[PDB]
Design a protein around this ligand. Structure first.
Ligand SMILES: *[C@@H](C)[C@H]1/C(=C/C2=NC(=C\c3[nH]c(C[C@H]4NC(=O)C(C=C)=C4C)c(C)c3CCC(=O)O)/C(CCC(=O)O)=C2C)NC(=O)[C@@H]1C
Ligand SMILES: C=CC1=C(C)[C@@H](Cc2[nH]c(/C=C3N=C(/C=C4\NC(=O)[C@H](C)[C@H]4CC)C(C)=C\3CCC(=O)O)c(CCC(=O)O)c2C)NC1=O
Ligand SMILES: C=CC1=C(C)[C@@H](Cc2[nH]c(/C=C3N=C(/C=C4\NC(=O)[C@H](C)[C@H]4CC)C(C)=C\3CCC(=O)O)c(CCC(=O)O)c2C)NC1=O
Ligand SMILES: C=CC1=C(C)[C@@H](Cc2[nH]c(/C=C3N=C(/C=C4\NC(=O)[C@H](C)[C@H]4CC)C(C)=C\3CCC(=O)O)c(CCC(=O)O)c2C)NC1=O
Ligand SMILES: C=CC1=C(C)[C@@H](Cc2[nH]c(/C=C3N=C(/C=C4\NC(=O)[C@H](C)[C@H]4CC)C(C)=C\3CCC(=O)O)c(CCC(=O)O)c2C)NC1=O
Ligand SMILES: C=CC1=C(C)[C@@H](Cc2[nH]c(/C=C3N=C(/C=C4\NC(=O)[C@H](C)[C@H]4CC)C(C)=C\3CCC(=O)O)c(CCC(=O)O)c2C)NC1=O
Ligand SMILES: C=CC1=C(C)[C@@H](Cc2[nH]c(/C=C3N=C(/C=C4\NC(=O)[C@H](C)[C@H]4CC)C(C)=C\3CCC(=O)O)c(CCC(=O)O)c2C)NC1=O
Ligand SMILES: C=CC1=C(C)[C@@H](Cc2[nH]c(/C=C3N=C(/C=C4\NC(=O)[C@H](C)[C@H]4CC)C(C)=C\3CCC(=O)O)c(CCC(=O)O)c2C)NC1=O
Ligand SMILES: C=CC1=C(C)[C@@H](Cc2[nH]c(/C=C3N=C(/C=C4\NC(=O)[C@H](C)[C@H]4CC)C(C)=C\3CCC(=O)O)c(CCC(=O)O)c2C)NC1=O
Ligand SMILES: C=CC1=C(C)[C@@H](Cc2[nH]c(/C=C3N=C(/C=C4\NC(=O)[C@H](C)[C@H]4CC)C(C)=C\3CCC(=O)O)c(CCC(=O)O)c2C)NC1=O
Ligand SMILES: C=CC1=C(C)[C@@H](Cc2[nH]c(/C=C3N=C(/C=C4\NC(=O)[C@H](C)[C@H]4CC)C(C)=C\3CCC(=O)O)c(CCC(=O)O)c2C)NC1=O
Ligand SMILES: C=CC1=C(C)[C@@H](Cc2[nH]c(/C=C3N=C(/C=C4\NC(=O)[C@H](C)[C@H]4CC)C(C)=C\3CCC(=O)O)c(CCC(=O)O)c2C)NC1=O
Ligand SMILES: C=CC1=C(C)[C@@H](Cc2[nH]c(/C=C3N=C(/C=C4\NC(=O)[C@H](C)[C@H]4CC)C(C)=C\3CCC(=O)O)c(CCC(=O)O)c2C)NC1=O
Ligand SMILES: C=CC1=C(C)[C@@H](Cc2[nH]c(/C=C3N=C(/C=C4\NC(=O)[C@H](C)[C@H]4CC)C(C)=C\3CCC(=O)O)c(CCC(=O)O)c2C)NC1=O
Ligand SMILES: [Cl-]
Ligand SMILES: [Cl-]
Ligand code: NA
Ligand code: NA
Ligand code: NA
Ligand code: NA
Ligand code: NA
Ligand code: NA
Ligand code: NA
Lengths: 164, 184, 164, 184, 164, 184, 164, 184
């Protein structure tokens, strides 16, 4: 699972090396930046349902055709699954803030997503709009510090880029 | 491979839940500098550790360096020194990550079976790993003895606390104990 | 040349990735640790001749046989080359402090060293004693801060390990 | 590959001398957080940049999407989108490193000859790269316009200084000019 | 194990061939040269302890610093091990005379030697001097015939070249 | 692989001892030219031996060349002829070396399991090897019969001795017996 | 081209080795065996036309069907080429005697022969019979020494085996 | 590769003719033992030759070990010692075979071009080879000087003739001259 420390260990093992100066220096980066990303992780852990709910609401407001007969937000089962999916993306973002790399989002969200949505006939634009709303919504210092918000916003843009 | 934080994420995902204990993550980070000291203390003394451990295994069992012994002839002594260093390398990766997965997956899986097919003696392998476990403890605490140093003593000069990093000594000792369990 | 930043770029490139969270975090580690290693680098730059002289002097003191006819410290040409070689190692350590990885020492000092010394019949023990003396010599705060000393000592111990 | 600091060490080794002047190095460090913001501004916006740059190249030259054009049929448009993204990725690596060697060695070496043997047009490739240069300048300064954003505007929120990182804009622009020079 | 006959069989097997003219010719060479090399093998078998003893004494005479506190000939255990090592090289030379190729010296002496001596801090010059003394010592017809001495000296030089 | 001389060296190395019995070595050398003639007698007649041995296995078991039989259809007969030749070739290497290790290590190790997985019948394999053993003994003695050869008969013209190389006949026969042993 | 010395050189080069004891011993085998094979080569250099003519005659005596309309010995051009072909094989055997390995016969006679004869509809039995006659024909000491004849016969048998 | 005898064969095959001249072949055989002594004299002394020749090149051209020199840093010194040994090894193969084809085909073909791409200096390459040529001549004649060897002097003890193998010295020298011509 990709993080600061797993990346330097994999590089060291490929060359047969003990941890050296540049490996320890990399991990010092994690010690310094952890305060920002862990602040974001804590705010998201405590408020994930409301954050997901308003991002889901925005994507339906942009695309009301989804409520029409036969479309992807039209039944009670479909509505519940779409909100669930937006919450899954935010949970994997929470995990990625904890780890300090994109690993949890890469392995459990992004891998396979295009194949699943194509098989089920789900459009990608509502996913992009949910994440886009979440990316433009936060401000500092109200919601979290400026550097906490920089970390949260970077992961939202990483998920948007994977769908675009 | 996993690290201490990605381990916690796997556990949270088994109930599709957010990671809620921010206090415990924070204390891990608060010990991060002492962790980097601990890794520096092993890596910086590795050659001396390996050669002293393999020599100690031998001085305690002279059968290894006579006809039919598993450190005879030169090629076998050299393979043994190589293996003691590989094992210490993977133990140091686990200490850096704060999780045993790299050690289990890249070093220990299938090692017992490999050794059984070659006739590499288990008792002797375990003794070398025991000597390295003791050496690592002393270097992490920055209390190696002159009696054991063979005139090659090193001091690390890290800021002293009363416990001398007892938590990290226990953690490092646990990874050596995983190697011993795997080969026994 | 191995450093914090070239390690993370090489890993990103092997997976076809833009720089991401863990790559920037690794580089923040270089920003934080640079004060300690650049302090050591500036001390070594200003005093290299005296540091190398005392390490050289300590290795000949341990091995006076090298002064005997036919041995490696026995002529004026050999004495000058041996001091020069101790200074080459110290200059590579200074460069390694500047870069923040072992790259310059790996590429320009360690690579080929065992083949060279075997071909010329040069014993490796005096090189190890020179570097050993230098590793045990420093103390903080006299010579530099305690973290600058930690950086200097780790590169000395990396060189010692390559000969041992 | 080299980075800004190893480039300085290569210079010092040409005369077998210690690295003495550390003023330029200390300034690189003092500007380190702003360089990490500049990289974050390009990587975070990269899909929008690539699609808008290839689309602009096409709206200014409709021959590319007609019979005999180098973005016709679907496979060629897809290959072009892939190449603009590869180019931008290597420029971002150069900006993170503060040195062009990764861009020169792993992307530009042989690219002119490759495009000549395929019939990929130089004029059109240069225009795409010029549009990406302009986009990157605006994103680094955190001043993209609503008129060009097509409903997809992003603001980074970095701490503002009067010059808006002019030195980094010039360095990024010099990397895109190196790409163009390789093709011309 | 490398000898005249194992070399030619390996070549034949790599090409899927029965033994042919050039293979039988090569083994006739073994028949011709055996008298010289088995003469040397018999002399060495009967006197290995005295041959090794005087080579060991010669290397300590060259490098008396080895007897000083901390050094590699300084204790009773060390002194015994060093003599033992010189006798191991001579025994492998005996075996190589019996086989007619360098296989025994290659597999049981040379492979791993540099790694072992690095790890234990053992200088290679005293090994070279012991073998060099043995190489310069013999004369014909006193010790053995001129062709037997040629065989014995060639294997001593092969061992010295592997350490040089 | 080992030869007769390196086999003696491995035996001495088991007690870290010099090789002391020069008389046994000198005897192998004395019989060297005879050994070369023995190897020449088999290699020079190899094609005739393989074809006659496979044909004999068949004339004694007609089931092999009917539907369901392991020398039916053409591809299987061809594979069986190839295998008889491979086996003979490894036997001749063992004879040249004066040791079975190249035969054991490069031909026989894994052969029983290979044949069982393919359904190659052991009973018939044994017969082909037995006929090659008989042929080799007669060619080494330079006494093949007109009855078993017809116009294909060959005479070697080696210098005759009363025992017709009995010890080399017994050693070659022992290598064919090892091939048969490896099938059980 | 395969000989005693090229086989040992190729083996040494694959392992990056200087010539060593077993390589020199192999070449002594060439010194010893050369007398017999060069005797055979000299006999063949002086009488190749007669040796080939009688072997050609024997293969036609044996298979008179070759003289019938459409068969391989039926025209003046075909009769000349068949005799030429027997003389080619004898020349390549003369070469192999000079070299002390099968190289010239392997590279210039054997390689491709089965593809050529299949394409032209040339039967292999007459080739075998020409070489068989030549194998059974010689006797010592009338034609050459016993060991010269052993070398000539082994090369004839090697050719016969390549066609069988 | 070819040897002295296969060279004769290739020359005869160019006119589809038998090898007629046995005399020159028999002379090679007559000088066979002295040729084996000449190869033993180089192979046995190869490490001393290589290290002395590279050291000599350097003592005569100190720019090689100063800033920008082609034997700076350690890795370049190590590569040069490796190449001198390679060249000596191929010259020794040519002397054993009595023909230059192995040295031309496996060492010299393309080597001038390789060195021009790397910038390995021709004058210094040639000087290293010239020193080895002188060394080889003196070891073949068994007349090395104490002045050039000190305590590393070796005597071979081959049986002396008045010319000290003048024909083999001229042949060995011709192979070093071939290397110098290819590389100049
Ligand atoms: C290793 C020591 C051998 C050995 C070697 C021989 N060296 C021979 C000639 C020679 N060597 C050098 C290099 C030397 N001269 C210098 O000025 C410097 C550095 C200050 C060095 C290292 C040179 C230049 C020459 C002369 C080459 C030429 O003529 O162009 C030599 C042959 C001459 C002789 O023996 O008198 C040999 C054999 N000799 C030994 O016995 C050990 C095994
Ligand atoms: C874990 C991440 C995380 C977030 C990013 C936010 C996301 C978020 N923001 C708001 C809610 C709000 N957010 C803002 C912010 C702004 N209004 C502006 O005009 C400015 C541009 C900007 C900076 C002051 C405001 C003013 C409200 C209250 C009014 C509203 O709902 O729009 C709410 C509704 C609940 C509330 O009132 O707090 C939520 C869930 N919360 C989180 O838990
Ligand atoms: C761990 C990561 C992870 C995810 C992100 C989701 C992804 C995901 N979503 C659905 C399944 C679905 N997802 C939706 C989603 C939507 N409806 C809309 O109007 C919008 C386009 C959109 C929300 C933005 C719908 C409607 C289904 C059901 C589709 C169907 O059954 O046809 C399925 C198929 C299996 C199922 O029925 O649940 C999967 C794998 N699951 C995961 O395991
Ligand atoms: C007769 C042969 C023989 C040996 C070779 C040694 C081998 C040896 N070394 C240590 C024990 C040790 N060895 C070292 C090693 C070193 N300390 C440094 O300052 C250096 C950098 C480095 C290499 C010399 C350390 C640090 C210890 C821990 C105990 C201590 O320091 O007192 C132990 C105790 C193990 C245990 O507690 O289980 C043993 C048996 N003993 C023997 O009886
Ligand atoms: C770039 C790296 C760098 C270094 C590591 C030092 C290395 C160094 N140390 C000393 C010199 C010294 N260093 C010490 C230090 C100590 N004495 C002890 O017994 C304690 C354990 C330890 C901490 C107080 C002392 C006391 C001297 C002066 C006396 C002496 O020469 O030993 C000197 C001689 C000049 C001087 O007085 O400063 C040098 C070159 N200098 C450098 O430029
Ligand atoms: C590491 C660096 C690196 C690169 C830069 C690319 C370079 C590259 N591009 C293409 C391949 C191509 N590149 C283009 C690009 C374009 N067509 C246009 O009209 C525009 C002007 C332009 C985009 C701006 C097209 C159309 C092809 C396909 C050409 C064809 O097959 O006809 C190919 C051939 C193989 C393939 O089809 O993928 C290669 C090697 N690959 C790399 O590995
Ligand atoms: C009709 C076809 C056609 C187009 C497709 C566009 C193509 C286009 N885009 C830009 C120019 C730009 N394009 C972008 C891109 C973006 N800004 C954001 O906030 C998003 C994240 C992202 C993707 C939309 C930016 C940032 C600029 C820089 C100039 C500016 O922002 O004003 C430019 C100016 C280039 C120059 O100065 O040389 C052109 C020609 N124009 C056309 O004539
Ligand atoms: C791991 C991820 C990571 C990052 C993404 C950066 C994020 C980051 N940027 C700055 C800080 C800064 N960032 C900028 C950047 C800019 N100013 C402008 O006017 C332009 C819009 C833009 C051009 C690049 C500036 C100017 C500062 C203030 C410090 C300086 O002057 O360099 C700071 C220091 C705190 C502060 O000053 O508030 C941090 C932590 N660092 C990291 O560790
Ligand atoms: C298996 C290999 C094998 C050897 C190589 C020899 C090695 C050897 N040589 C000598 C001993 C000797 N060796 C020599 C030889 C010489 N003195 C000279 O001045 C000449 C240059 C040279 C040729 C005559 C002499 C004269 C002695 C006795 C004096 C002495 O010990 O130096 C001794 C002491 C025992 C003895 O006296 O024989 C030994 C072990 N023995 C062996 O078993
Ligand atoms: C009806 C089918 C049928 C066959 C195909 C043969 C097969 C056959 N051949 C031999 C036996 C043999 N076969 C050969 C072969 C040869 N001798 C030469 O001179 C040639 C170079 C070469 C190929 C012809 C030899 C040398 C013997 C040994 C016995 C002898 O020569 O008398 C034996 C006896 C084996 C034994 O003792 O167990 C058998 C059964 N017999 C059969 O019943
Ligand atoms: C490179 C190719 C090469 C060879 C093929 C052999 C050829 C060869 N064989 C013998 C010599 C011999 N060969 C045999 C062989 C045999 N006696 C019998 O009765 C059996 C039919 C047969 C069993 C194997 C015997 C018995 C001798 C006589 C020497 C002895 O008794 O060992 C001799 C010595 C002749 C002499 O004294 O001058 C030579 C050179 N050597 C070679 O170098
Ligand atoms: C260096 C080695 C070498 C050889 C051995 C020959 C092999 C050889 N022979 C022939 C060609 C031929 N060879 C023969 C031979 C024979 N007719 C018979 O009755 C018998 C079966 C047989 C002699 C024993 C005939 C008749 C042809 C001509 C066939 C044709 O053109 O149809 C050809 C085709 C080209 C040509 O027409 O010459 C070749 C390559 N050539 C070589 O370069
Ligand atoms: C280069 C190789 C080479 C050869 C192998 C021979 C081949 C050869 N042999 C004979 C000729 C002969 N060869 C023999 C030999 C024998 N008769 C027997 O019954 C015995 C078994 C056998 C041993 C005495 C005899 C008796 C003749 C004369 C009668 C005849 O032609 O059959 C002739 C005719 C010219 C002559 O009379 O010599 C030729 C070309 N010549 C060579 O140049
Ligand atoms: C397997 C390994 C093996 C070898 C190493 C050689 C060893 C060897 N060399 C010679 C024999 C010889 N060796 C030399 C060599 C020389 N004379 C000089 O004056 C120069 C110093 C030197 C130049 C090369 C000479 C001159 C002879 C004598 C025979 C002759 O004149 O050619 C002999 C014949 C016995 C004798 O004459 O004493 C042997 C067996 N042969 C082998 O089988
Ligand atoms: Cl040493
Ligand atoms: Cl046919
Ligand atoms: Na994308
Ligand atoms: Na090791
Ligand atoms: Na080491
Ligand atoms: Na060497
Ligand atoms: Na079976
Ligand atoms: Na065949
Ligand atoms: Na030239």
């Amino acid at each position: 699972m990709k993080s600061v420390v797993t990346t330097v260990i994999a590089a060291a093992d490929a060359a047969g090396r003990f941890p050296s100066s540049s490996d320890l220096e990399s991990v010092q980066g994690s010690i310094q930046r952890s305060a920002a990303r862990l602040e974001a992780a804590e705010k998201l852990a405590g408020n994930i349902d409301a954050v997901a709910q308003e991002a889901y609401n925005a994507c339906i407001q942009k695309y009301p055709y989804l409520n029409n007969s036969g479309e992807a937000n039209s039944t009670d089962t479909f509505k519940a699954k779409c909100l669930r999916d937006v919450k899954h993306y935010m949970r994997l973002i929470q995990y990625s803030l904890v780890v300090g790399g994109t690993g949890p989002l890469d392995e459990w969200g992004i891998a396979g997503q295009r194949e699943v949505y194509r098989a089920l006939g789900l459009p990608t634009a509502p996913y992009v709009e949910a994440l886009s709303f979440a990316r433009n919504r936060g401000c500092a210092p109200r919601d979290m510090s400026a550097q906490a918000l920089t970390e949260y916003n970077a992961l939202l843009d990483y998920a948007i880029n994977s769908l675009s | 491979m996993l690290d201490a934080f990605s381990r916690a994420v796997v556990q949270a995902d088994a109930s599709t839940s957010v990671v809620a204990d921010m206090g415990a993550l924070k204390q891990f980070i608060a010990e991060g500098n002492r962790r980097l000291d601990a890794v520096n203390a092993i890596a910086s003394n590795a050659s001396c550790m390996v050669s002293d451990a393999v020599a100690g295994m031998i001085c305690e069992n002279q059968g290894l360096i006579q006809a039919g012994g598993n450190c005879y002839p030169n090629r076998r002594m050299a393979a043994c020194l190589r293996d003691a260093e590989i094992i210490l390398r993977y133990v140091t990766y686990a200490l850096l990550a704060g999780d045993a997965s790299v050690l289990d997956d890249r070093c220990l899986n299938g090692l017992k079976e490999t050794y059984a097919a070659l006739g590499v003696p288990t008792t002797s392998t375990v003794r070398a790993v025991q000597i390295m476990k003791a050496q690592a403890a002393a270097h992490i605490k920055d209390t190696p003895s002159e009696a054991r140093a063979g005139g090659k003593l090193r001091k690390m000069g890290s800021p002293v606390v009363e416990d001398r990093c007892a938590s990290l000594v226990a953690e490092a000792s646990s990874y050596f104990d995983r190697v011993i369990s795997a080969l026994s």
